Design a protein around this ligand. Structure first.
Ligand SMILES: Nc1ncnc2c1ncn2[C@@H]1O[C@H](COP(=O)(O)OP(=O)(O)O)[C@@H](O)[C@H]1O
Ligand SMILES: [Mg+2]
Ligand SMILES: [Mg+2]
Lengths: 325, 333
C-alpha cells in the first residue's frame, strides 16, 4: 500500500479526482490518497502540502485555476525538470491520425521560459532564451533513460541549431554526448520546422523526441491535437529527489464544474502513467484497458467526446469493466 | 525583357532552376537570369555579392542555401543574412488544398504573413560564464507594425475577413506583448476585418484538427517557421507551396518551406511544383501576368493527373516527366 498526494484542483477537478480514486478502488489499486490543497501564500505553496509531497515522492494533480501561476511554483518547489507526454491514438476515438505513438520529452526549467525580459528602449523588447550545460545534459540523460526503461528504440533531438547556433547547438551537443554513452538506443537530430512538417504528414515516423522548453511546449500540444486533444492526454512532470507529479493539462471548465458532464479520461490516463512509474504495471494495464474499452463501446461517452452521458455514467462503466480484470 | 537574379542554392535548388529555365524558354518568357552562387565558405564574399546583385535587379528567385550547424556561431545562415540585409520584412505563403492532392484535411485556405527579419532570428547570443548561453529574441514596434500593416492590407485587398495574431504573450509578456500591441494598433484602422489572437500552442492543435477556421494569420519569426510548416504538411508537403519575401523595394521568391533537399538531390524525384509556382509569383510581381497565369494553369493542371505525381505526394513520377507534362499544357496555348 503506497501513498500518493492528491491535488484535486479547481472547477471540474474535485469531480474527476473523485472519479479516478473511485476507479482505482474498483480496481483494488494499492494506493491510498493524501488530499492536499495548493494555494499561493504570501510566494510559495502551503507549508503542510510541500512536506506531504516530500514524504510521498509521488503526486497526482487536477486542473488548476490561474491568476503567479500555480504550475510555475510547483515546478520550482520540487525542481520538476522533465515534462513527459505520451500520445497514443485512442481506438474508440477516431481522428485523422490513427497510428500515433509518440513521447515528447520537454526540458522544463530554462530555455525561453527564462523569466527574463527587458524593455531596451520604448518599442524595442528583448526576451532572453537561456540554455545551460547542466539542464541540457540532465534532460538528455532523462530521455535516454526513459527510452531504455519504457521499451523505446529511437530518440530524436529537436532543435534550430542552424538559427540559434550557440544556445540550441549547446543543447544539441549534450544530447549527442549522451547518445554516445547509450548506444543501445538509436539517435538522430531534426530541425524543429522539419519535425512539424513531417509530424502532420506521418506521425508514425517518430518515437521519442527530446527538446528545449518552448519547442516541447508547442510540440506536445501539437501531438495532443493528433489524438483528440487535451481532454484525453496524459502528462507527467519528473523532478529532483525521485519526485514526480502527474497531471491533467485541460482547462478548469467552470461552466460545468459541478453539474457532472466532466471528462476524467486525461487525469485517469495520467494516473495510469503514475502507476507505471511506480512499477504497478498490472493495475495500470487493467485501468487503461477498462478506460479504452469504455471509450470504444461509445455508450457512456461524455459530451466532449461527442456523447450524451454524464461523468457519473462514464466513471461507473469504467468501474464496472475493470472488475472483470 | 527583364533581368532577374537567380541563386541556385544547394541540394535540389540547382536542378529545379534548370527546369524553371526550360519552362521559361518554352513559354517564350522575356526574362534573363543572372546567376550568382553562394558556397560553403565562412567567408561572406559570395553572400555580399548576391545581395548586391539583387539591389540592382531588385527581384530574385533562389533555392535554399545549406546551413551547417556544426560550424561556429560566427558562421551564420546565408539565407537569413540575405533577407535581413535586404530588409525583406514580409514572408508570405498561401496554403490552399489542392483538389488533386488528397490528404487528411480539405477546405484549407490560409494566408500566412510572417515577420521575416527580427525575433528569434536576430543571431544575438553569448556565453557570460562557461556553459551558460543566452540568446536574445528581439521584438520591435517598427517591425511589428509593418508586418501587421502588411497583413491587414493583404486581407482587405484579397477580400478576406479575419486576421489571427499568433503569439505566446502569456509567457513572453513584454516581447510577444508588444507584437500584439502593434497588431491591435493596426486593427483600429481596419474595422471591417475581424481581429483575433491565439497562443501558438493552441494554434498548432487547432491546425491539425480544424484548420478551416483560419483565414489570414500574422505572427513573429519563429512561430512563422512553425505554422508555415504545419500548413504546408496539411496540404501535402514541401513540394507544393511557393514562398515570397517582400521588402519595400525588393522581392525574393522561393519555396515555402525553404528545404535544401540534399537527401534527394540528383535523383530526378524532386517535386517541381513549389518552385514553378514561386517563379509564377515572380512573374506576377514583374507584371508579366499573362506568362504567369499561363505557366500556373499548366502546373495546376499537371497536378490533376495523379500519374504525374512525384513520391512526396504519393505518386511515382520523376521531376522530368512532370516538366514534360507542364511544357505540354503550354505548347497547346
Ligand atoms: N521538392 C521536394 N520534393 C520532395 N521532397 C522534398 C522536396 N523538398 C523537400 N523535400 C523533403 O522535405 C524534407 C525536409 O527537407 P530538408 O532537405 O531536410 O531541408 P533542410 O536541409 O533545409 O533542413 C526532406 O525529406 C526533403 O527530402
Ligand atoms: Mg503547452
Ligand atoms: Mg533549410
Amino acid at each position: 500500500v503506497q501513498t500518493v498526494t492528491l491535488i484535486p484542483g479547481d472547477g471540474i477537478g474535485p469531480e474527476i479526482s473523485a472519479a479516478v480514486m473511485k476507479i482505482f478502488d474498483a480496481a483494488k489499486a494499492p494506493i491510498q490518497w493524501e488530499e492536499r490543497n495548493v494555494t499561493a501564500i504570501q510566494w510559495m505553496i502551503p507549508s503542510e502540502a510541500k512536506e506531504s509531497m516530500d514524504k510521498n515522492k509521488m503526486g497526482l494533480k487536477g486542473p488548476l485555476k490561474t491568476p503567479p501561476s500555480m504550475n510555475l511554483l510547483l515546478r520550482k518547489t520540487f525542481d520538476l525538470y522533465a515534462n513527459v507526454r505520451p500520445c497514443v491514438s485512442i481506438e474508440g476515438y477516431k481522428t485523422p491520425y490513427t497510428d500515433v505513438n509518440i513521447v515528447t520529452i520537454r526540458e522544463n526549467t530554462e530555455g525561453e521560459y527564462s523569466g527574463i525580459e527587458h524593455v531596451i528602449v520604448d518599442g524595442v523588447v528583448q526576451s532572453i532564451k537561456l540554455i545551460t550545460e547542466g539542464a541540457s545534459k540532465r534532460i538528455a540523460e532523462f530521455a535516454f533513460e526513459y527510452a531504455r526503461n519504457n521499451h523505446r528504440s529511437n530518440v530524436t533531438a529537436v532543435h534550430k541549431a542552424n538559427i540559434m547556433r550557440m544556445s540550441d547547438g549547446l543543447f544539441l551537443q549534450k544530447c549527442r554526448e549522451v547518445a554516445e554513452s547509450c548506444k543501445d538506443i538509436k539517435f538522430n537530430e531534426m530541425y524543429l520546422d522539419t519535425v512539424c512538417l513531417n509530424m502532420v504528414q506521418d506521425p508514425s515516423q517518430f518515437d521519442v523526441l527530446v527538446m528545449p522548453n518552448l519547442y516541447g511546449d508547442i510540440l506536445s500540444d501539437l501531438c495532443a491535437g493528433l489524438i483528440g486533444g487535451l481532454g484525453v492526454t496524459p502528462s507527467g512532470n519528473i523532478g529532483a529527489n525521485g519526485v514526480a507529479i502527474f497531471e491533467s493539462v485541460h482547462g478548469t471548465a467552470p461552466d460545468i464544474a459541478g453539474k457532472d458532464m466532466a471528462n476524467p479520461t486525461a487525469l485517469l490516463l495520467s494516473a495510469v502513467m503514475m502507476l507505471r512509474h511506480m512499477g504497478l504495471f498490472d493495475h495500470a494495464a487493467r485501468i487503461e484497458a477498462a478506460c479504452f474499452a469504455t471509450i470504444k463501446d461509445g455508450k457512456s461517452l461524455t459530451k466532449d467526446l461527442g456523447g450524451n452521458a454524464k461523468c457519473s455514467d462514464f466513471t461507473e462503466e469504467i468501474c464496472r469493466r475493470v472488475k472483470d480484470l | 525583357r527583364h533581368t532577374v537574379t537567380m541563386i541556385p542554392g544547394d541540394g535540389i535548388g540547382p536542378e529545379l532552376m534548370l527546369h524553371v529555365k526550360s519552362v521559361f524558354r518554352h513559354a517564350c518568357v522575356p526574362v534573363d537570369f543572372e546567376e550568382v552562387h553562394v558556397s560553403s565558405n565562412a567567408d561572406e564574399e559570395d553572400i555580399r555579392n548576391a545581395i548586391m546583385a539583387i539591389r540592382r535587379n531588385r527581384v530574385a528567385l533562389k533555392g535554399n542555401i545549406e546551413t551547417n550547424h556544426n560550424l561556429p556561431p560566427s558562421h551564420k545562415s546565408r539565407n537569413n543574412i540575405l533577407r535581413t540585409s535586404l530588409d525583406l520584412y514580409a514572408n508570405v505563403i498561401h496554403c490552399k488544398s489542392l483538389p488533386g492532392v488528397v490528404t487528411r484535411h480539405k477546405d484549407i485556405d490560409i494566408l500566412i504573413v510572417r515577420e521575416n527579419t527580427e525575433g528569434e532570428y536576430s543571431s544575438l547570443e553569448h556565453e557570460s560564464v562557461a556553459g551558460v548561453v543566452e540568446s536574445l529574441k528581439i521584438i520591435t514596434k517598427a517591425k511589428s507594425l509593418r508586418i501587421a500593416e502588411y497583413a491587414f492590407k493583404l486581407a482587405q485587398e484579397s477580400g478576406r475577413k479575419k486576421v489571427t495574431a499568433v503569439h505566446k504573450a502569456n509567457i513572453m509578456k513584454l516581447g510577444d506583448g508588444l507584437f500584439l500591441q502593434c497588431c491591435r494598433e493596426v486593427a483600429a484602422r481596419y474595422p471591417q476585418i475581424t481581429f483575433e489572437n491565439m497562443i501558438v500552442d493552441n494554434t498548432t492543435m487547432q491546425l491539425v484538427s480544424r484548420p478551416q477556421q483560419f483565414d489570414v494569420m500574422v505572427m513573429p519569426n519563429l512561430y512563422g517557421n512553425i505554422v508555415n510548416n504545419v500548413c504546408a504538411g496539411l496540404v501535402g508537403g514541401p513540394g507544393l507551396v511557393a514562398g515570397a519575401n517582400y521588402g519595400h523595394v525588393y522581392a525574393v521568391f522561393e519555396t515555402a518551406t525553404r528545404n535544401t533537399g540534399k537527401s534527394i538531390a540528383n535523383k530526378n524525384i524532386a517535386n517541381p511544383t513549389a518552385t514553378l509556382l514561386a517563379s509564377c509569383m515572380m512573374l506576377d510581381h514583374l507584371k508579366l501576368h499573362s506568362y504567369a497565369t499561363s505557366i500556373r494553369k499548366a502546373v495546376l493542371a499537371s497536378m490533376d493527373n495523379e500519374n504525374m505525381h512525384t513520391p512526396d505526394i504519393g505518386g511515382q513520377g520523376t521531376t522530368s516527366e512532370a516538366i514534360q507534362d507542364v511544357i505540354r499544357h503550354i505548347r497547346v496555348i
